[PDB]
């Protein structure tokens, strides 16, 4: 038996651990261990987003997960969408606990620009937010930009290739969130010694209507990865629309970082 | 075509509106309207159950749903497990808004004993709590008893016939809850003129391992229904294990109350 790995999965803003409900048993049936982190004010986390005023607070449950791992264990750390940012923040704190970072339809930040740089770049050219509701919350850390996805926007731009049941599930579980773009723009740049030292790969869906191909190529061109994997027919929510094919991708990454 | 109906679906303790993610699109594909309510401190409500101290506070979202219906609209109101108690409370308030009550693997209270009667009976009888964690919380009006299911318990007694993904999903979303036994013990009896005036039917799963088949006849003997429907092969979480058969049962019920 090839030795198996421990996958740590990190969800996107406005969602929670639940998004991995299809992928997690597939990985576990193949012998791997899986930890699906619930970030602050996400999923069933008892805080509202208004109480989570910085990206460091938002990311704390991932940092805690990594901190709690036994000596010398290393994980395959998978960041989805805004979870690319969380996993970068984590890699700058515990680089030696991460075998490889997996940027799944994710923001891939660099070590040259402020950490908000790839978000700011997408936000400028994003296309329609549809029925998404924007709001502000003033805090001792400044003003937080909040959003709550609207259902037409979800259907059209996130879930377009997902079974109707997954879309209904998401309608019942998605929450108001934030991309923390203000807090990120004033944070120290990610380090070359921490984050920059960790192996990375990028997994993209061919039909992601949120993170388009040319934008991904721009991010990778600014900050290279070791390999790129494509999931044909995937929407942005690829763990919901193509979980088997996502399994196949992760399995191929796990064989590549054997030992 | 047949006249379609508005189904209001009420989940069980420790769960939320998400449980209905397979059934809702089935009902909606057939032309019906569906509202899946989220009870207080349930699902993604960022309020802990400790803050909700009374069954009336718990049930408020359901009450609000019915109050918001336009004048003369009537619904088929479906309560699952503890949701049986919520639908009875609602029927004592708005009996004329309810075409029929559907007790789905549910507690069916009577109008003779104190409202906690059927819950107290089940707690005396039931020996399989397993790794469920029981606890108390003191309020200004007395002890409030709480529970958080354990995952071994869930698998053995609630989800044993569900796809593994549904179990994984429940593990990521279940929460500490309450059956409000003390509060319900102090409450006035349900009335004949409200709750007892409403049409009611029972839908049971043939392999319910928490609400046993005999306990169901005992409840229906204490308080009769118009009709009992049986879903063959269902576990307790029958909207997850046998959603198409549950859809069949509710479509038969809707045909029976041609509105
Ligand atoms: O990928 C996560 C996301 C969340 C809200 C809006 C757009 C994208
Ligand atoms: O059916 C709901 C339920 C909830 C918690 C424990 C046991 C049963
Ligand atoms: Cl995101
Ligand atoms: Cl229950």
Beta bridge partners of A202: A103, A228
Helices (H) and strands (E) in chain A, counts: 10, 8
Indicate which residue of A11, A15, A117, A236 is catalytic.
Answer: A236
Helix (H, G, I), strand (E, B) or coil at A62: helix
Burial class of A209 by CB neighbour count within 10 A (0 to 12, 13 to 18, 19+): middle
In the annotation, is B81 catalytic?
Answer: yes
How far apart (Å, rounded) are the C-alpha atoms in residues B97 and B75? Answer: 6
In the annotation, is B15 catalytic?
Answer: no
Provide the number of structural domains found in chain B: 1
Phi–psi pair at A187, nearest 5 degrees: -85, 150
Assign residue A149 the CATH number of its domain.
3.40.50.1820
How far apart (Å, rounded) are the C-alpha atoms in residues B247 and B227? Answer: 16
CB of B13 closer than 6 angstroms to any ligand 2 atom: yes
B84 CA → ligand 4 middle, Å: 9
Shortest distance between the Cα of B40 and any Cα of chain A, in A, equals: 13
Of B163, B146, B172, B173, which Cα lies nearest the Cα of B45? B173
Residue range(s) defining the domain that contains residue B96: 1-259
What residues contact A47, with CB distance under 8 A and at least 6 apart?
A40, A41, B46
Of A178, A226, A168, which Cα lies nearest the Cα of A202? A226
Query: Which among B21, B38, B46 has CB closest to A169?
Result: B21
Strand B142-148 and strand B133-139: the pairing is antiparallel
How far apart (Å, rounded) are the C-alpha atoms in residues B66 and B7? Answer: 11
Beta bridge partners of B228: B202
∠ CA A135-A173-A46, nearest 5°, is 75
Indicate which residue of A42, A59, A81, A178 is catalytic.
Answer: A81
CB of B10 closer than 6 angstroms to any ligand 2 atom: no
Of A240, A12, A38, which Cα lies nearest the Cα of A105? A12
CB of B249 closer than 6 angstroms to any ligand 2 atom: no
Of A190, A223, A164, which Cα lies nearest the Cα of A85? A190
- Closest residue of chain B to A47, computed from CA coordinates: B46
Helix (H, G, I), strand (E, B) or coil at B135: strand
Query: Which among B22, B48, B165 has CB closest to A46?
Result: B48
Using N-to-C axis directions, what is the helix angle for B55-67 and B83-93, rounded to 10°? 60
How far apart (Å, rounded) are the C-alpha atoms in residues B176 and B15? Answer: 9
How far apart (Å, rounded) are the C-alpha atoms in residues B64 and A103? Answer: 43
Helix (H, G, I), strand (E, B) or coil at A150: coil
Indicate which residue of B42, B59, B81, B249 is catalytic.
Answer: B81
CB of B146 closer than 6 angstroms to any ligand 2 atom: no
CB of B81 closer than 6 angstroms to any ligand 2 atom: yes
- Which residues of chain B does A166 touch, with a Cβ-Cβ cutoff of 8 Å? 21
How far apart (Å, rounded) are the C-alpha atoms in residues A8 and B246? Answer: 36
A10 contacts B149 by C-beta, under 8 angstroms: no
Strand B200-205 and strand B228-231: the pairing is parallel
DSSP code of residue B156: I
- Which residues of chain B does A21 touch, with a Cβ-Cβ cutoff of 8 Å? 165-166, 168-169, 172
Burial class of B174 by CB neighbour count within 10 A (0 to 12, 13 to 18, 19+): buried
- Distance (Å) of CA A53 to CA A41, A150, B187: 10, 23, 42
How far apart (Å, rounded) are the C-alpha atoms in residues B146 and B134? Answer: 6
Entry resolution (Å): 1.8
Q: H or E segment at A203? A: strand A200-205
Helix (H, G, I), strand (E, B) or coil at A185: helix
DSSP collapsed to 3 states, B38-102: CCCCCCCCCCCHHHCCCHHHHHHHHHHHHHCCCCCCCEEEEEECCHHHHHHHHHHHCHHHEEEEE
Burial class of B29 by CB neighbour count within 10 A (0 to 12, 13 to 18, 19+): exposed
For A41, the token pair is 């004010």
Beta bridge partners of A256: none
What residues contact B159, with CB distance under 8 A and at least 6 apart?
B166, B167, B170, B235, B236, B237, B240, B241
How far apart (Å, rounded) are the C-alpha atoms in residues B226 and B199? Answer: 7
Residue A26 Cα to chain centre, angstroms: 19
**CB pair distance less than 8 Å for B43 and A165:** no
What residues contact A196, with CB distance under 8 A and at least 6 apart?
A111, A190
Shortest distance between the Cα of B44 and any Cα of chain A, in A, equals: 5
How far apart (Å, rounded) are the C-alpha atoms in residues B239 and B90? Answer: 22
How far apart (Å, rounded) are the C-alpha atoms in residues B25 and A94? Answer: 44
What residues contact A10, with CB distance under 8 A and at least 6 apart?
A37, A39, A62, A77, A78, A79, A80, A83, A86, A87
Beta bridge partners of B148: B133
Q: Is the dihedral of CA A132, B169, A97, A106 positive or negative?
A: negative
**CB pair distance less than 8 Å for A36 and B172:** yes
């Amino acid at each position: 038996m090839e030795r198996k790995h421990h996958f740590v999965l990190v969800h996107n803003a406005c969602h929670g651990a639940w998004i991995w409900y299809k992928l997690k048993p597939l990985l576990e049936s193949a012998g791997h261990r899986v930890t699906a982190v619930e970030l602050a004010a996400s999923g069933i986390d008892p805080r509202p987003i208004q109480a989570v005023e910085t990206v460091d607070e938002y990311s704390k449950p991932l940092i805690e997960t990594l901190k709690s791992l036994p000596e010398n264990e290393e994980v395959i750390l998978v960041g989805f969408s805004f979870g690319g940012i969380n996993i970068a923040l984590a890699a700058d704190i515990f680089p030696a606990k991460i075998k490889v970072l997996v940027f799944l339809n994710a923001f891939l930040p660099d070590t040259t620009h402020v950490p908000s740089h790839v978000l700011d770049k997408l936000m400028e050219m994003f296309g329609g937010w549809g029925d998404t509701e924007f709001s502000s919350h003033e805090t001792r850390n400044g003003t937080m930009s909040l959003l709550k996805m609207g259902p037409k926007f979800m259907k059209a731009r996130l879930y377009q290739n997902c079974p109707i049941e997954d879309y209904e599930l998401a309608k019942m579980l998605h929450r108001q969130g934030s991309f923390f773009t203000e807090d990120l723009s004033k944070k120290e740049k990610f380090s070359e010694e921490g984050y920059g030292s960790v192996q990375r790969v990028y997994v993209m869906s061919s039909e992601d209507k949120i993170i388009p191909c040319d934008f991904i190529r721009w991010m990778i061109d600014n900050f290279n990865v070791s390999k790129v994997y494509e999931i044909d027919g995937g929407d942005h929510m690829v763990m919901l629309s193509k979980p088997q094919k996502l399994f196949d991708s992760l399995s191929a990454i796990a064989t590549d970082y054997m030992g």
